[PDB]
Amino acid sequence: TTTVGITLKDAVIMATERRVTMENFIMHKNGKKLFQIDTYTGMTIAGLVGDAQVLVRYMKAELELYRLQRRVNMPIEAVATLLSNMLNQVKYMPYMVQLLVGGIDTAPHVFSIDAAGGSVEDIYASTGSGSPFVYGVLESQYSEKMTVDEGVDLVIRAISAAKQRDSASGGMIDVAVITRKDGYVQLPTDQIESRIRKLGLIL
Amino acid sequence: TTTVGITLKDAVIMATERRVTMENFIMHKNGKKLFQIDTYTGMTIAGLVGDAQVLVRYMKAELELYRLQRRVNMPIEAVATLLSNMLNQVKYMPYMVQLLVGGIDTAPHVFSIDAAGGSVEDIYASTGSGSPFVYGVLESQYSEKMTVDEGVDLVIRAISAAKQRDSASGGMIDVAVITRKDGYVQLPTDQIESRIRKLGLIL
Amino acid sequence: TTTVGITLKDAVIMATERRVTMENFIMHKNGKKLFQIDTYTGMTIAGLVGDAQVLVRYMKAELELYRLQRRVNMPIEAVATLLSNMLNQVKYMPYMVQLLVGGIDTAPHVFSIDAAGGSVEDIYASTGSGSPFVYGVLESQYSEKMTVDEGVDLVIRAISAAKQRDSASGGMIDVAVITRKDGYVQLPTDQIESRIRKLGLIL
Amino acid sequence: TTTVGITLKDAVIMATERRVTMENFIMHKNGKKLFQIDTYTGMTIAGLVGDAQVLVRYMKAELELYRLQRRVNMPIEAVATLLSNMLNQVKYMPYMVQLLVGGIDTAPHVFSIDAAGGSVEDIYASTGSGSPFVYGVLESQYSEKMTVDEGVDLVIRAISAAKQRDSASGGMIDVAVITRKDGYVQLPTDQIESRIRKLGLIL
Amino acid sequence: TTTVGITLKDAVIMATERRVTMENFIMHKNGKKLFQIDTYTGMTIAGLVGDAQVLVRYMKAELELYRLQRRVNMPIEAVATLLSNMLNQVKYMPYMVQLLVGGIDTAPHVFSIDAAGGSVEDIYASTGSGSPFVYGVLESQYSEKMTVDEGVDLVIRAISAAKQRDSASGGMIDVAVITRKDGYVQLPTDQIESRIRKLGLIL
Amino acid sequence: TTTVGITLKDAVIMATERRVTMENFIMHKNGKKLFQIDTYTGMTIAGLVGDAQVLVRYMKAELELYRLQRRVNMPIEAVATLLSNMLNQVKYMPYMVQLLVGGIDTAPHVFSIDAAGGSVEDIYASTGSGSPFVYGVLESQYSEKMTVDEGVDLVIRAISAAKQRDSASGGMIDVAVITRKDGYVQLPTDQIESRIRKLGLIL
Amino acid sequence: TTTVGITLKDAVIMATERRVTMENFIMHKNGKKLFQIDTYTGMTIAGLVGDAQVLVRYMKAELELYRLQRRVNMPIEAVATLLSNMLNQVKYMPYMVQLLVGGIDTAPHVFSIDAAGGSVEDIYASTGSGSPFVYGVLESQYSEKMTVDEGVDLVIRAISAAKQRDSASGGMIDVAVITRKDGYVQLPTDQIESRIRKLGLIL
Amino acid sequence: TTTVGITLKDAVIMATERRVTMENFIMHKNGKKLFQIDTYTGMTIAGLVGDAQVLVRYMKAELELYRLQRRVNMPIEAVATLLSNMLNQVKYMPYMVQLLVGGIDTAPHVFSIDAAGGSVEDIYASTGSGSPFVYGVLESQYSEKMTVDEGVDLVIRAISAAKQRDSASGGMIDVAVITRKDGYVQLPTDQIESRIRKLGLIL
Amino acid sequence: TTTVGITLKDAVIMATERRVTMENFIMHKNGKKLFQIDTYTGMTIAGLVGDAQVLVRYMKAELELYRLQRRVNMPIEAVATLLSNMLNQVKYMPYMVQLLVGGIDTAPHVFSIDAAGGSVEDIYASTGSGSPFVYGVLESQYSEKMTVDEGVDLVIRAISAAKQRDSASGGMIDVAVITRKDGYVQLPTDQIESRIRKLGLIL
Amino acid sequence: TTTVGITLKDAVIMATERRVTMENFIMHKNGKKLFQIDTYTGMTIAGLVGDAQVLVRYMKAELELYRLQRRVNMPIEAVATLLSNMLNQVKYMPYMVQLLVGGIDTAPHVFSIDAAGGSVEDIYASTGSGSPFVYGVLESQYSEKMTVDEGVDLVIRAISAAKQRDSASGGMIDVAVITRKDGYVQLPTDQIESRIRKLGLIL
């Protein structure tokens, strides 16, 4: 699996690929690993699919509830703190996952949460077996000053590189942009494919 | 075991074979691995027989109840989400199974669920020891544009191939077609055998 | 890895893909897994690369020597018997490989040898992590009566299927045809790619 | 694997099936498990294929040599005693096999040798995963007074039963009759198939 | 232990032997392994004696209760489904047993249940260490068209074979015939012994 | 296995049964466990068949050689001392056997040797899984003043008892009497059977 | 430990010896292993002393209570069924014992119960480390037609044999006879000693 | 550690960093991991320092010897084949290393050799804990059409990325360029530092 | 990680670095390890991030509550005693952390608490993988008579040394000064950087 | 243990402490860990005392021999290369040591060698349990431009720090200075003690 989340001045870009393996056996080429979980919040999942999928549903429920009760969206750091507490509560029988939580409140944020509830904020983050390859691309090519279009291209490149070198990663690249203005928009497939061609790439 | 579920434009085809082994010892040649669990829903089971059989009964019960309470059938994705929650709830003392759930609601669907509750939708899926051989046949020969008759032939071929190379698979091939028009129809044995002959095959 | 060897009336076709992984990490996309080892003999390798590569060199050496000493090529069954003895001699400190040996003497032959020296002749055989998918395609689609052109297409399909579902397999498909008339000919890349297009496929 | 060897008044009938598995994966449907090793001597193999195949070759060599040196064939009990010594010599790094040795010297004989060199003579014997099923058929149906035709039918039945209940057994049934008069004759396939039909059976 | 249950057109025959061992030590030659548990229902037990004996008592109690509460006997499939649920409920602290359940409702039935609650119906079934030998005899000799007398003979033969080759099996053969007409009748010892003589056998 | 050796005033009686098991599976009902190894010397074997059979052959060879070289038979205590040295030499890679050695030199003797080369003389001794049952019979019923006919009856009883309670023991009882006057005489089967009837017994 | 229980036409004889060891260390030479637990019921204990002694007390209590509540003694088979249920209830934290339960209701009975609650009835039974020796003596010497005096002599002999060959057995032999006429009578020491002399024996 | 080797049209660029750690403890900041081993050949080392350093010395010695004996430099593929044989010879007591071998013969080459002797040629390759990060950068940024200056920049970037994300990597970046024209030239530190500034980077 | 806490006459200085690693993989370069937890109290964290972060939140909550309830701040020794009790309560399922707690009540204090609840006061203390390097610097360079400016410089040096030799440590140095006069003041980044330059250092 | 070796412009300073422990038990307070091994060469030892002491003797012997044979001292890098080869030769049965080798040839040098033969040159190095504390002091306080007197003071400080925090270090500090002008001079105890006072320190 490869997931990535980056922040720019007023945006958050999150992307994943879609491969699901049982060992070397590619059982599903189009699983879903990027989810909207609130108006301006997205989550990526890596690790044990069952544990991840349960957590996706809990977060959808818990944030929808919070928003009705409070009439404001949960702060992104509050979402991360909630996951932090849930995962740590069960550390000795853990959710075997790596989570990225990204969104906009008064500012853009990306948080990376591990299976023991450790949560750290960062300007960018990647998770899954393909993440080291993404970290390479991002160290070399990421700028804070990037435009949203430049960011979408950057993540497409990072995940394309990870797909080329991690057999546990593959399938269509899946991208969401999160802005105050339009909210959580999942880019359409035409558009992603189009940029894969314009950048000169594959899968 | 070999089970398979495929989707076509307005149909779902599900098939299994019937062998039950304790190690190399073929104890039963005609066990049942394909079950109707709702008006337009079917389930295939692989893995520990006892765990599977319990789950078949639960799902029959839980979907019948739902239907009476809601006056609509459970959405196929809802059935998968239910199984997802149930299996994950007990992940450390798991149901040692692989499940396929297929059916029609507003569209055709096939879902594959694992022993930790991970559920992924796909245009086709196979489970059991014989599944890799089925995946071979399907990669080469499946078309979205296939007719129901072509689909039935395709699954018969896939399962026949798996029977030839997986000693844990064998016995009569067992096929169900699910359409909005006729519901869950289990094909009769005359008819399956007839196509085994017309395609030129064995067991 | 995926390798395959098939026999037709007066020919042997052998093919592989080229991916080399250390776990999930795709380190090389164009390793070589198909080798000519005599005038009418080819070998495919799967398993530990170092052990395989040593064995390739030994066989080249041992068959060249034999041929000069005997003024006839080693019978294909003799090549298999030699490997059988070598691998079994060291079974407790084994060459961790699966070998296919194919060629023409008075008739076409394909032999499959394992890490303990077990050698079995067969009309077709496949090795490596992707082999079960190939076995699917071959069970469904192989005919003894196939022409060489049909055979080449068949193996391309089988390996393509395996590439789609085995993350340990990937890269350019690599094909050799062995006949009494032209000997061991390795098909050129233009030609393989051409048929990948004509059959409608990918990687 | 299923092998059997029976004795009648002036004959020895030996049979096997031909399936070769790596776990549940049927890699070869026509391996060879019955071999002539002297003028009036046959051997069946079960267990690790590499170890068995090496032993077949050693026995062929050692008995051909003995016969030239002595101008008489090795007594069947001498063959068994030789295997006994060889296998026991290497008991802590054993040949992981079960062997049946059958033949005629001054009388018919069947010997069963294990991986530690234990050798016992018996009026009939079976080896491999399918052997318990054969022992069932033979206990119920074997007579000392049987004719060679009756014996050939009996072993076909025994192996057919084992094939039906041992997934590690399958493929064509392979029969050799050993008489003073004609020596070691391997029955042709037409003839075996013919009796499968006449007895009303399958694979 | 060896138990067997077969079905004929309007009958069920169930038989066991009576040996109880602690390892190689034959502690009891006449234990009981065949029990009537309802008017037209019988059960055989194999595995841990304590667990089996407890289950025999539960089933007697539960079916007697059911019958009084419903005024009809529990369907044979219902008895198997009940056992299925019970055994699976406690799969991680299991009843270490193999059960056969046979009887007549609207038709004859035999069910085989394992220690994890897996239950499968079949035209015949055998359980215990001696079962593979029985499966040999039955594969070769069982007909659907057999008469009750022929059936009784067949099971006597099957168990006699198993007694000859399984040291964990021995003692008097014990037979029950279940018909709508006479109910569960346990054949007398005179009669079984008589047929052992007429068929020419031992223990 | 059950073997026994007893001494009387001018005689040694040695007996065994003939069952050979692989676990609970009775593979051979008439193996041989009593052997003449010199003019007035016999040996019984229990434990791993391969190791025993090799030792039988060595002792035959070594005692035949000794006798030619010395022109006297090896003293019975010498035979035990030789075995003692051989077995102890290889104690860390042992012959996994229990041996009884019995014979006449200037007096009758029975020696019991274990897998580490410990050898102890005794007026009687038993070996194998059935030995404790023999020791019961002998403690109760053995007299030093018994006649050879009484001795033969005693051992038949002891081994019959052991056969009844040790599933690892069974088959025809096999008896040898060793006197200065007639040497090592193996009793014939008619005669043993005859006494089994006269004493009122079974197998 | 050695305990025995035999049945005769209208009697039950039960006996034990009295040695208590911690490993090879004989800590007590006169422990008690035979107990009256009802008017016509006795129990022998083998295994862990603590567990056995607790069970003796429970059975005394539970049978005294039953008798007052029902005004009839618990049937001997009921006592065995009660122990069966108690021991099986705690099979994973078991009473590490072997129990014999003997007595008269409408007929004599002996039952043998193990640590998992398995209970089997038999005409005779023995328990403890010395039981195989007893089983030898009983197989050879027990008759159904024995008189009480003959029975008492037989059990003294059996336990004497066991004492001679099982270092975990020793001490005074302790005998109870149970009849309808005189109830549970424990034979006096003078009398047992007397018969030890008259039979010609030791300890 | 991070090492990298790339090929361009008439050049090979090889680079490493210099950190040596014992676990998390940075013991040396300037170890050497890039060595000239022939006129137009270089080697990088990763893995156990001791093993690597020994191999560097062997290769220097063996290639210097070869060159004097042949009067031509060892072909780069020959150097890789030599290492292949050496490392595989001792696979069960291995050199715990990853090697890159790069150079010019009639063309440029880079080979990657592992601890079991597996050697694969490639247009680029990276080794050590930091290699995945390098593989990211190279996938995204490497062109075959790059000039030597562009290449030098590319490897500086790749290693700088790896230094940023692999704590096992750090220290001065060390670069060698290999051309037919100037041979193996190790770039000076001024020049590397200069480009680190011009590209805008750190350590 | 490297954290340090020192005491001076009327001040406490606490510092950390910010690196977060998963093994050798630097996932985050600016995590937070120094937190204000009361008006005059600070806490540093080392060990498992999840466990630490939970404890930070608990202490913030528990000390805010205490302060409102008592109208005084919790004594620093009280905070350490509270942590001591909490961590020891769960010693067998521990918070896998090392904590420093520093502050002013009537005097300055630094306490070091371990994962089993052991708490010790000291004039200075360091925690994390880089602590031994800090202890070196402090032993050599710390004076009780240091001024706050000298203290700040000392800790910057200590942590810079640790960063140079512990790959688990890195990132911006983070410093807080705690006085009665100004409370807990976190120094600004300009100022820390400024001193790094003035002292002549790096990262 | 704590040893250190530093280089200055024309000098090498090496120092150790003298404590020898078996676990927590201080058996010797004045062991020797610094040795002259050639005219301008010194060695420090840490790790298993036996292994270290043997190596000291070998190096004295081997360098004395080399010097007589070559008439020049072994280059310091040659000494490190020799130890490298010796230690690596026996890596699987290793000398469990850490060695520092320091000296002057055409320039000053310090080398650090590990138990697997890895040798790295450095401007300074420390070994033993107390080395991390030394590395702290040296990172903060070492200058290339130091004078010999300043160096001697620096190492006294570093080892004093280590003594204060590593219970495995203690005893008199032991210092050698190596120059071209005066050779290897071991500083006298008066002088070291004197500087301990002048710097204001302890043990």
mmCIF file with all atom_site columns, C-alpha atoms in Angstrom, chain A residues 20 22 25-32 48-51 53-54 57-58 92-96, chain B residues 81 84-85 88 91-92 98 112 116-122 124-127 131-132 135 139:
data_model
loop_
_atom_site.group_PDB
_atom_site.id
_atom_site.type_symbol
_atom_site.label_atom_id
_atom_site.label_alt_id
_atom_site.label_comp_id
_atom_site.label_asym_id
_atom_site.label_entity_id
_atom_site.label_seq_id
_atom_site.pdbx_PDB_ins_code
_atom_site.Cartn_x
_atom_site.Cartn_y
_atom_site.Cartn_z
_atom_site.occupancy
_atom_site.B_iso_or_equiv
_atom_site.pdbx_formal_charge
_atom_site.auth_seq_id
_atom_site.auth_comp_id
_atom_site.auth_asym_id
_atom_site.auth_atom_id
_atom_site.pdbx_PDB_model_num
ATOM 1  C CA . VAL A 1 20  ? -5.066  -5.375  -2.021  1.00 0.00 ? 20  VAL A CA 1
ATOM 2  C CA . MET A 1 22  ? -2.723  -11.530 0.535   1.00 0.00 ? 22  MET A CA 1
ATOM 3  C CA . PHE A 1 25  ? -1.293  -12.773 -4.387  1.00 0.00 ? 25  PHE A CA 1
ATOM 4  C CA . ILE A 1 26  ? -3.025  -9.677  -5.850  1.00 0.00 ? 26  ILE A CA 1
ATOM 5  C CA . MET A 1 27  ? -6.685  -10.421 -4.898  1.00 0.00 ? 27  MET A CA 1
ATOM 6  C CA . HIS A 1 28  ? -8.103  -6.985  -5.641  1.00 0.00 ? 28  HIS A CA 1
ATOM 7  C CA . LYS A 1 29  ? -6.778  -4.286  -7.927  1.00 0.00 ? 29  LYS A CA 1
ATOM 8  C CA . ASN A 1 30  ? -9.336  -1.553  -6.888  1.00 0.00 ? 30  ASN A CA 1
ATOM 9  C CA . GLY A 1 31  ? -9.810  -1.438  -3.165  1.00 0.00 ? 31  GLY A CA 1
ATOM 10 C CA . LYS A 1 32  ? -10.520 1.873   -1.559  1.00 0.00 ? 32  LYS A CA 1
ATOM 11 C CA . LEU A 1 48  ? -4.965  -4.803  8.134   1.00 0.00 ? 48  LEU A CA 1
ATOM 12 C CA . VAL A 1 49  ? -8.007  -4.094  5.936   1.00 0.00 ? 49  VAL A CA 1
ATOM 13 C CA . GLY A 1 50  ? -10.617 -5.266  8.465   1.00 0.00 ? 50  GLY A CA 1
ATOM 14 C CA . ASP A 1 51  ? -9.258  -3.047  11.267  1.00 0.00 ? 51  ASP A CA 1
ATOM 15 C CA . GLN A 1 53  ? -12.475 -0.445  7.497   1.00 0.00 ? 53  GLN A CA 1
ATOM 16 C CA . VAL A 1 54  ? -14.017 -0.612  10.978  1.00 0.00 ? 54  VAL A CA 1
ATOM 17 C CA . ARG A 1 57  ? -16.921 3.666   9.791   1.00 0.00 ? 57  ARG A CA 1
ATOM 18 C CA . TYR A 1 58  ? -16.382 4.685   13.446  1.00 0.00 ? 58  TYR A CA 1
ATOM 19 C CA . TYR A 1 92  ? -2.120  -4.719  23.533  1.00 0.00 ? 92  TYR A CA 1
ATOM 20 C CA . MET A 1 93  ? -4.912  -5.909  21.151  1.00 0.00 ? 93  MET A CA 1
ATOM 21 C CA . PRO A 1 94  ? -4.336  -3.228  18.575  1.00 0.00 ? 94  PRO A CA 1
ATOM 22 C CA . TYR A 1 95  ? -5.904  -1.998  15.378  1.00 0.00 ? 95  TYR A CA 1
ATOM 23 C CA . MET A 1 96  ? -3.056  -3.068  13.075  1.00 0.00 ? 96  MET A CA 1
ATOM 24 C CA . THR B 1 81  ? -20.786 -4.320  5.957   1.00 0.00 ? 81  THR B CA 1
ATOM 25 C CA . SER B 1 84  ? -17.370 -7.018  8.072   1.00 0.00 ? 84  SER B CA 1
ATOM 26 C CA . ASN B 1 85  ? -18.441 -5.846  11.575  1.00 0.00 ? 85  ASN B CA 1
ATOM 27 C CA . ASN B 1 88  ? -13.839 -8.083  12.852  1.00 0.00 ? 88  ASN B CA 1
ATOM 28 C CA . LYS B 1 91  ? -10.781 -11.058 14.988  1.00 0.00 ? 91  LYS B CA 1
ATOM 29 C CA . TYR B 1 92  ? -8.646  -12.561 17.806  1.00 0.00 ? 92  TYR B CA 1
ATOM 30 C CA . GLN B 1 98  ? -13.407 -16.563 3.280   1.00 0.00 ? 98  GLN B CA 1
ATOM 31 C CA . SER B 1 112 ? -15.162 -10.651 -0.872  1.00 0.00 ? 112 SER B CA 1
ATOM 32 C CA . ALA B 1 116 ? -10.607 -10.217 9.946   1.00 0.00 ? 116 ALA B CA 1
ATOM 33 C CA . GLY B 1 117 ? -13.664 -8.511  8.426   1.00 0.00 ? 117 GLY B CA 1
ATOM 34 C CA . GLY B 1 118 ? -11.926 -6.909  5.469   1.00 0.00 ? 118 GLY B CA 1
ATOM 35 C CA . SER B 1 119 ? -14.495 -6.507  2.707   1.00 0.00 ? 119 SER B CA 1
ATOM 36 C CA . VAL B 1 120 ? -13.699 -5.351  -0.863  1.00 0.00 ? 120 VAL B CA 1
ATOM 37 C CA . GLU B 1 121 ? -16.089 -5.026  -3.828  1.00 0.00 ? 121 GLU B CA 1
ATOM 38 C CA . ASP B 1 122 ? -14.899 -6.234  -7.216  1.00 0.00 ? 122 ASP B CA 1
ATOM 39 C CA . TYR B 1 124 ? -15.180 -10.673 -9.998  1.00 0.00 ? 124 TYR B CA 1
ATOM 40 C CA . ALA B 1 125 ? -13.628 -12.635 -7.123  1.00 0.00 ? 125 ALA B CA 1
ATOM 41 C CA . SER B 1 126 ? -12.622 -16.210 -6.188  1.00 0.00 ? 126 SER B CA 1
ATOM 42 C CA . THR B 1 127 ? -11.938 -17.922 -2.881  1.00 0.00 ? 127 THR B CA 1
ATOM 43 C CA . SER B 1 131 ? -8.808  -19.648 -6.450  1.00 0.00 ? 131 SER B CA 1
ATOM 44 C CA . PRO B 1 132 ? -5.476  -18.881 -8.056  1.00 0.00 ? 132 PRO B CA 1
ATOM 45 C CA . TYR B 1 135 ? -7.992  -16.071 -11.310 1.00 0.00 ? 135 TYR B CA 1
ATOM 46 C CA . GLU B 1 139 ? -7.846  -12.765 -16.279 1.00 0.00 ? 139 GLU B CA 1
#
